[PDB]
Design a protein around this nucleic acid. Structure first.
Lengths: 71, 175, 136, 37
RNA sequence: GGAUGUGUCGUCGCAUAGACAGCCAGGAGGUUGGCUUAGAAGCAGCCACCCUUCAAAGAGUGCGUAAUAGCUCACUGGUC
RNA sequence: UCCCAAAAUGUAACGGAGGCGCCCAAAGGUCACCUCAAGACGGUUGGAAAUCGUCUGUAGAGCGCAAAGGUAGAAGGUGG
């Protein structure tokens, strides 16, 4: 995931100041193809499972996540 | 708090777990002597912004407020207490503690927010409805955000005795 | 540590605390429970150790400054007068006093920042917490 | 064996015993084998 | 300064709607979490410590390697 | 002359600090009168203070030298 993510945002390494200097952001659309491959490794109950499971992964790599609910 | 005695002589208590306070207003400054343990468990909560039941031996419930407590040094233990009877529409002035809530935007950032002034005093509390606390926003606060009296939302009425531009909390930088 | 300028000498006497508050400048504080002389190098030995433990925050308050000059033996003799204005500076502490008090960091992450500091003190202390509301 | 004056636990095993007049330390690990005396 | 050596007062506490210690079994999937490194994968050091399932299983106790790995813990059920 | 000296006085040490062996025809007698340090605002070589001005002002100044007490209704500052 981290690799595909790097490629997608274009990110370059990872980050040690993911609280100060982070790195980027992407859209759920991407998150789709991701799960559509990691699936044989996504013991997910139905989507969301893996739709949000992957959040944290992206959420501790320094990756700001788009949209979601409401408004 | 069933305090019963109230004499100048405390031999009958000093040995027996019993604090020793005094109450008043401008009318009755009844001599006193309440129980150690009780007060001990008591004042913890209601602190000085909490009027409680004062039925002195004989039964005469009275309304007062924790004014000033002077405890022993060496031994964290309290020795004397002043209860300033409540009022009805105006007591005097009260000591109300400052509090924070929700993570600040300075914490995760790279530094820590500091509370320059723990308990805060405002002019005129309002007997019957006197803030037994004071939660305050901090989040916004970044790398050098100082909050003051001119900020903290007050509880409908209550006026700030503390000078405005006086910093109550700031988010101190790192290291 | 060492004062900036002054008179130069002194004397010696004791009696229980007098101006050692309790809570102030922090939530957690360390209190001294015995009459002693706190060497300025005995404070550094405390602060410095405390720092280490705290990877940041500096919310350590040392509120026991060395307001006192002690002297010493120029080697032996006794036929001369006042001696060694410069042996060292100490800060008379008395019981109930508050030398230390951290801030921000967890209980445990404090019950240790002190413990240690205790280990280099000539006197016994004990950690205190809150309910400190006299004057402000 | 370790004869220290300030004996105390060193890991979730140290079973500070008190045999004949002495305060001891018995832990799975030996370098933990303490003893005031 | 150290310590299940005793005596007496105080505080949490957590609890037959069946805990603690002991026992059989389990132990999560992302993930060798991102970062850093010659690499370090729950355990040299920055950042966080979220998602999913569930009765459960915390990006994490300590031991261990050059990292692996392996060994147990916190969370889960029966037997008393 | 301060501190030590333990609130009367006094009280030691090769205890802690510091001055004197003068000075003033006037820095005296007496009689009149004025009143300080300093900050702030605003002003010329000025520009840091200092001169002028206007508010504040127990005097936080002054008193020939060391300190202490004392002192502005003057022992403070001028003139006959």
């Amino acid at each position: 995931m981290s690799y595909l993510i790097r490629k997608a945002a274009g990110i370059g390494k990872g980050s040690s100041t993911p609280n100060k200097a982070k790195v980027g952001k992407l859209n759920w659309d991407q998150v789709l193809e991701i799960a559509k491959t990691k699936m044989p490794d996504l013991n997910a109950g139905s989507v969301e499972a893996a739709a949000n499971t992957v959040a944290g992964t992206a959420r501790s790599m320094g990756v700001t996540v788009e949209g979601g609910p409401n408004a | 708090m069933e305090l019963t005695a109230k004499p100048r002589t405390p031999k009958q208590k000093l040995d027996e777990s019993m604090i020793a306070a005094v109450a008043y207003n401008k009318e009755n400054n009844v001599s006193f002597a309440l129980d150690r343990k009780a007060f001990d468990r008591a004042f913890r909560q209601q602190s000085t912004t909490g009027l409680f039941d004062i039925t002195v031996e004989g039964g005469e419930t009275f309304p007062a407020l924790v004014k000033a407590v002077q405890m022993d040094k060496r031994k964290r233990a309290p020795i004397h207490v002043d209860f300033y009877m409540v009022t009805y529409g105006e007591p005097v002035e009260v000591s109300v503690p400052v509090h924070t809530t929700g993570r600040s935007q300075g914490e995760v950032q790279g530094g820590l927010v500091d509370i320059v002034v723990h308990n805060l005093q405002i002019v005129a509390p309002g007997p019957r409805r006197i803030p037994q606390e004071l939660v305050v926003d901090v989040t916004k606060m970044n790398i050098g955000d100082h909050i003051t009296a001119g900020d903290i939302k007050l509880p409908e009425g209550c006026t700030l005795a503390a000078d405005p531009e006086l910093t109550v909390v700031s988010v101190l930088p790192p290291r | 540590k060492r004062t900036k300028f002054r008179k130069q000498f002194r004397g010696r006497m004791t009696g229980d605390a007098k101006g050692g508050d309790y809570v102030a400048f922090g939530d957690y504080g360390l209190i001294a429970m015995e009459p002693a002389w706190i060497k300025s190098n005995q404070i550094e030995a405390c602060r410095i150790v405390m720092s280490r433990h705290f990877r940041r925050g500096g919310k350590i308050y040392i509120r026991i400054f060395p307001d006192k000059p002690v002297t010493k033996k120029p080697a032996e003799t006794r036929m001369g007068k006042g001696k060694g204005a410069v042996e060292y500076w100490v800060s008379v502490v008395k019981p109930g006093r508050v030398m230390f008090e951290v801030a921000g960091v967890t209980e445990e992450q404090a019950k240790e920042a002190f413990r240690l500091a205790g280990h280099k003190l000539p006197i016994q202390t004990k950690m205190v917490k809150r309910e400190v509301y006299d004057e402000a | 064996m370790k004869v220290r004056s300030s004996v105390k636990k060193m890991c979730d095993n140290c079973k500070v015993v008190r045999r004949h007049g002495r305060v001891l330390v018995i832990c799975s690990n030996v370098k933990h084998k303490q003893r005031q005396g």
